[PDB]
């Protein structure tokens, strides 16, 4: 029972940290996309 | 027992998520700095 309770708490911390990491990965992706667009446009203009 | 094995597997997933998220956050900050700096280079070039 107590083992299952700590399992639940660690699972909650795990899903929270996983969502934070996935959101950071999405922000990393978005940084890459705007990098691509701006670099293409300014360098293409050049 | 099996529940202790699940405790351990959750612990590995937890530490992996911690390192993953920390590295992703620092990478996002570094990537933003790189974007801004090269933009300043490219706008100046134009």
């Amino acid at each position: 029972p107590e083992l299952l309770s700590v399992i639940r708490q660690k699972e909650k911390d795990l899903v929270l940290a996983a969502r934070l990491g996935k959101a950071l990965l999405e922000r990393n992706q978005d940084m890459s996309r705007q990098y691509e667009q701006m670099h293409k446009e300014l360098t293409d203009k050049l | 027992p099996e529940l202790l094995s699940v405790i351990r597997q959750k612990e590995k997933d937890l530490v992996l998520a911690a390192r993953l998220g920390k590295a992703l956050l620092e990478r996002n900050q570094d990537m933003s700095r790189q974007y801004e700096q090269m933009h300043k280079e490219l706008t100046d070039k134009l």
Binding site: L25, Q29 | D13, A17
Partner: peptide
């Protein structure tokens, strides 16, 4: 971001 996505997929499956 391959290892990142692999871990996230594995955790979503769990």
């Amino acid at each position: 971001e391959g290892v990142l996505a692999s871990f996230f997929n594995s955790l979503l499956s769990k």
